[PDB]
Design a protein around this ligand. Sequence first.
Ligand SMILES: [Mg+2]
Lengths: 56, 195, 175, 139, 50, 191
Amino acid sequence: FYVPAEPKLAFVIRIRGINGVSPKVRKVLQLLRLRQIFNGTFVKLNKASINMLRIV
Amino acid sequence: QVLVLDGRGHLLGRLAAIVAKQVLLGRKVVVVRCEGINISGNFYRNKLKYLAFLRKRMNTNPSRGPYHFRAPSRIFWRTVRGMLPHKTKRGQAALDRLKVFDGIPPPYDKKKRMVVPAALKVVRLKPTRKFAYLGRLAHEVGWKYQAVTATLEEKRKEKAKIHYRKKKQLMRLRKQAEKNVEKKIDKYTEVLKTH
Amino acid sequence: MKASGTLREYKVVGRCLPTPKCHTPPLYRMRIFAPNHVVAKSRFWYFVSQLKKMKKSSGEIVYCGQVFEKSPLRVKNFGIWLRYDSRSGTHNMYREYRDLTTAGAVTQCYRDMGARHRARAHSIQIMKVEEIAASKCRRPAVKQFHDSKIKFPLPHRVLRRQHKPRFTTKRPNTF
Amino acid sequence: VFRRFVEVGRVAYVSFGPHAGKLVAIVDVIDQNRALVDGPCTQVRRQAMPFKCMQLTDFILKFPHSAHQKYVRQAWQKADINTKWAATRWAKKIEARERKAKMTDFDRFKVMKAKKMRNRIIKNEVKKLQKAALLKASP
Amino acid sequence: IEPSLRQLAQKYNCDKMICRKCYARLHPRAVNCRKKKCGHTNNLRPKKKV
Amino acid sequence: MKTILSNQTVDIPENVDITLKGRTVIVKGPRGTLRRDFNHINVELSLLGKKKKRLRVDKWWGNRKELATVRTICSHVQNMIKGVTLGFRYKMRSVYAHFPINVVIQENGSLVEIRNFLGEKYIRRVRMRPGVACSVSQAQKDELILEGNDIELVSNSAALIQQATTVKNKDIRKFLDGIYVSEKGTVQQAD
RNA sequence: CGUCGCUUUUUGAUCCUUCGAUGUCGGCUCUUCCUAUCAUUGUGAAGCAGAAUUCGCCAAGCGUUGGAUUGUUCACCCACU
RNA sequence: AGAACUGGCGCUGCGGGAUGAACCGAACGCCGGGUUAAGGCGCCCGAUGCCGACGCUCAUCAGACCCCAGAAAAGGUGUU
Ligand SMILES: [Mg+2]
């Protein structure tokens, strides 16, 4: 079997709203530059960033 | 102009839902022979939920209050009434293009009547399940015109079996009259494009 | 899982990451019925983590491919083994179907466990599936179609309402 | 009462769906509401069609249960269905219903003018029978 | 008296079962009351002899 | 389950000839004619074969409680062969203590007028379903006989006497009084 | 011995509404409603012989009084039914 | 009745939950086009007027959509 390299880039969009949001999980959206609903950003895939996307 | 719906073999609310949409849209609808409307569920169940409706009555005087109609023309009329916005003037006029009758009156015994396959009992019930006629759930509760209606219908239906006698007398004639000759030149172009 | 639409079979193999203690782990194989290849590699880690000490952070899948049937045009008999959860306890259950394809019989099961037992698609596990032959069937709804020169009519036909004219002068005959 | 059954070989029409208007032959039933059919000479290959989508005719075909594509094809043409189908009064109704559907604006003029001509001639020769009817009943 | 006619009338009057819940009068080889009022229960007892 | 069909067949002797209008069954025999309509029961009736006259009632598909109704067709049909070739006869005897139960017939068998039921002054005029008639028996005490072609018209009418002679406000474990049926037989025998 | 409930005609518990005010017991008068039926209709079961009782069922149609003591609600007694 | 963490209401309209402080979506300058969220599409009432798929279910007290606005033990040769 050949298993390839798990990817280095990811595209993240925000599918939820601004209001009723926990204080850890709105700091990271502020760090992903995901402030409005339906805003997108490319994200470098890293262990430090994979655990940021699991918070949110 | 006006659609004329023969009411028998139909269900109560499936027919009343289609009439209450055709009459907000500006049509005139005449529902005829409401005595033969079916209603699903066995007869004792539909007769209970009309007797439960009768005890709804405002305490201080029943003269003001819920008007419990008893003829099946008005039972079906109040079913259509509850599917129309009858407290607005767009819905007041909607109830007034509906002339629902009982039996078949002399304007309407000589018009061709349509049915609604979306509300027929044969289409819409599964045949191993029971149904109630609106004619004898009206009769069991206070309606006093069942026998004088059935008398006039069997005199109405007898005047049409002599109409259908002589209508197919003409159809036998003009099928033998089209047997003859020399109209083959016109049948060249009608058989070619759906006779 | 939601089990949306027709399902789809997947062969999902995978191994855990090579430790200083065990180079070359044995790399197990499963047989996942799932709507797409993202839920399939998710449910691979649901069952493997029930049997081994493997989990997705300490493992990787090495192949997830759709395995499809080798005879789509052959009428087969599928008896399958279930492990659904009920409201009181949980139950083991053998349950036959009959379909042209392997993946559509297990679709027909989720549609049938939800229908007869109100069992949602998450509280149900598929133990194994195989084609069985006749004279090894138990269920008479499946058994009655094992009939050379089978024949039946279609009584009381009804279809195509409002697509025709909603108002007509013609009572529709049901054959 | 129930003069036509589903059966291995029963040639069915297809009313709606993505194979509408073409014939099939019932090869095998699977369970209660779907059936494996094919049309080998009418361009609808082997697949499972539901029964409410199909449309039973009076044609049977004799071939063994759940055969291959070839032995249905030999049975389709040893019986010669496609010639015998088109010479029946229901294949002529489905053909005429799409002759009227493609009747253009000039052709619908010609269907008009050659209709009111023959409706005169039939109404003359049906009124010349009304006069002939009372003259019989005058004695 | 007529002891054959005694046993004939006792076929319709005494040789029956009585439900402990719906209090019906069923038939002497019942297992269930036939009435929906008791949910077709299965605790019966024979009719009490003289 | 929705099973593939079930069917019972009815062997029919030659002295009875059955026609069918549909789910109506017309049964003509020696001692009259009688008909039933099964237009509520959703089945097909096909009488097959010359010279033998088999009647096969079969119900396609069907649920389990509509599988229970194909046997009810053929059992009502056999009771129309039986009733029109042999008749039905329910012999009912009068079981009474101290008070004799006096019974007469007013009108041609159609009215049974029971009096002196357990010392009572009130008469009991029980009219019968049309098609049956009565007879006070011979060579047996206190017996009444009911004869007719339709089993539902004999037996319902037999139940109208047995319900009319009902003891009120008393123990019915003693006070065994009434006109109960004794036998379920035919008018012509041994055939 | 247990154990699951319902009801809001008991009493609490709570403190939501009302402190620029919702007139606070009882009786009398009068109308309606409920059924968890005391009696009357039709019924089934008794350890129902009859008489009398008893226990269930459909059922609120129609009745459910006259008094002595007591401010009584409640009580208790006399008498009729 | 009293605390912990977070969000909200108070200060906040809007779509939905028929109704509504707090539920669910989403926060708001004045408008046109487009598309959706939660929820829905027999008729009130916009939209299934799809030739929608598979089953289950008959109630003489049927069932019917978070919060949420009514039920339990026990039982049924009722049906699957
Ligand atoms: Mg949430």
